[PDB]
From a paper:
To enable time-resolved (tr) SFX studies on IPNS catalysis, we exposed anaerobic IPNS:Fe(II):ACV microcrystals to dioxygen using acoustic droplet ejection (ADE) tape drive methods with simultaneous monitoring of the Fe oxidation state by x-ray emission spectroscopy (XES). To focus tr-SFX analyses on events associated with O2 reaction rather than ACV binding and/or IPN release, we co-crystallized the anaerobic IPNS:Fe(II):ACV complex under anaerobic conditions to produce a dense microcrystal slurry (~3 μm × 3 μm × 60 μm, needle morphology, P212121 space group). The active site iron refines to full occupancy and exhibits square pyramidal coordination with ligation by His214, Asp216, His270, a water, the ACV thiolate, with an open coordination site trans to Asp216. By contrast, before reaction initiation and following its completion, all nonhydrogen ACV or IPN atoms are visible.
IPNS is a member of the Fe(II) and 2-oxoglutarate (2OG) oxygenase structural superfamily; such enzymes are widespread in nature and have important roles, including in collagen biosynthesis, lipid metabolism, nucleic acid repair, and signaling. X-ray free-electron laser studies including time-resolved crystallography and emission spectroscopy reveal how reaction of IPNS:Fe(II):ACV with dioxygen to yield an Fe(III) superoxide causes differences in active site volume and unexpected conformational changes that propagate to structurally remote regions.
Numbering used by the authors: 4 to 331
Write the structure that this text describes.
């Protein structure tokens, strides 16, 4: 019933060289991360009007033929190499949500991780240029725009924890990041299929159940339709929508590294019968990236938790999320 306190943080100093101003941003990241776990990043420099318009044009013009040709393995047995990247189909009358996921544009057939067949690395699939002119160029450019924003955010998290600003960002590299963009369409449907609505223990109608994120951080743009709720000790609280800002939260890899000092907030998606967009960028590191866990509450920072390689974390995490909350 209540509304979550989600502050709006001007992140523009993180692109600059005024070190005190960066510290003032870091303090606000720290405070939000220790409270509900969510904040809006504002003054971020990304053209989100164009993001939303180009995503809508793609979602509304793609045909069933094209969806089959781009489908991940869960929907097309022919595409055994597409576990992450491709189209995630809706099922008329049963499943409302549909989406398109793409990975690092640098993952080509000649990339060494692709040649080694390393798990979680795939080459992106794209629609025909002539049916969707400019879409691939836009989407690859967007990847690097949100990469740049995420790199700056990571400097803020580092300073917030008392570390040098490259503590996380040094592991977040264009040549090997496992980060993904997902372009999700939540449709207006009348009648809305009952199989696509889940009922929470507390009676709330949901589109996606409670979870912690599989990410270091999650950088999310959504249309202006309220849908997210965050769990607190006193129950779920509504996150108000803001279609000019990016909603930021930590994933479970951050909670692991920090001995839960920055928790991964549990959140869920309420069912709303409205046409809307949900466009997450999941900040993932490289396959071999390892950050030694530390405990910010302890003077010496010592913690007993085992270091975890990002690749093993991600592979287990994505499968666990499918098993718990369903194939999307
Ligand atoms: C809550 C939003 C981020 C969005 N949900 C989501 O994106 C949910 C929960 S964080 N995320 C996932 O299913 C993980 C997708 C991972 C992606 N295929 C990849 O290979 O990297 C929604 O609107 O449902
Ligand atoms: Fe999430």
């Amino acid at each position: 019933v209540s509304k979550a306190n989600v502050p709006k943080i001007d992140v523009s100093p993180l692109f600059g060289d005024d070190q005190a101003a960066k510290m003032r941003v870091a303090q606000q990241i720290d405070a939000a991360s220790r409270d509900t776990g969510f904040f809006y990043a504002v003054n971020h420099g990304i053209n989100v009007q164009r993001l939303s318009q180009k995503t809508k044009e793609f979602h509304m013009s793609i045909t069933p033929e094209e969806k089959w040709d781009l489908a991940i393995r869960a929907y097309n047995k022919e595409h055994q190499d597409q576990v992450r990247a491709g189209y995630y189909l809706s099922i008329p009358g049963k499943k409302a949500v549909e989406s398109f996921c793409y990975l690092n544009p640098n993952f080509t057939p000649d990339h060494p991780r692709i040649q080694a067949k390393t798990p979680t690395h795939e080459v992106n699939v794209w629609p025909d240029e002539t049916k969707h002119p400019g879409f691939q160029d836009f989407a690859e450019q967007y990847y690097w725009d949100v990469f740049g924003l995420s790199s700056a955010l990571l400097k803020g998290y580092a300073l917030a924890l008392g570390k040098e600003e490259n503590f996380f960002a040094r592991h977040f590299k264009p040549d090997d990041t496992l980060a993904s963009v997902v372009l999700i369409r939540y449709p207006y449907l009348d009648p809305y299929p009952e199989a696509a609505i889940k009922t929470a223990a507390d009676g709330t109608k949901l589109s996606f159940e409670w979870h912690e994120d599989v990410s270091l951080i999650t950088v999310l743009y959504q249309s202006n339709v309220q849908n997210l709720q965050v769990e607190t000790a006193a129950g779920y609280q509504d996150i108000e929508a803001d279609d000019t800002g990016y909603l930021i939260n930590c994933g479970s890899y951050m909670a692991h590294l920090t001995n839960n000092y920055y928790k991964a907030p549990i959140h869920r998606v309420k069912w709303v019968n409205a046409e809307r967009q949900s466009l997450p960028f999941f900040v993932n590191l490289g396959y071999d990236s390892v950050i030694d866990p530390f405990d910010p509450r302890e003077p010496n920072g010592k913690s007993d938790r085992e270091p975890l390689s990002y690749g093993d974390y991600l592979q287990n995490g994505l499968v666990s999320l499918i098993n718990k909350n369903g194939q999307t």
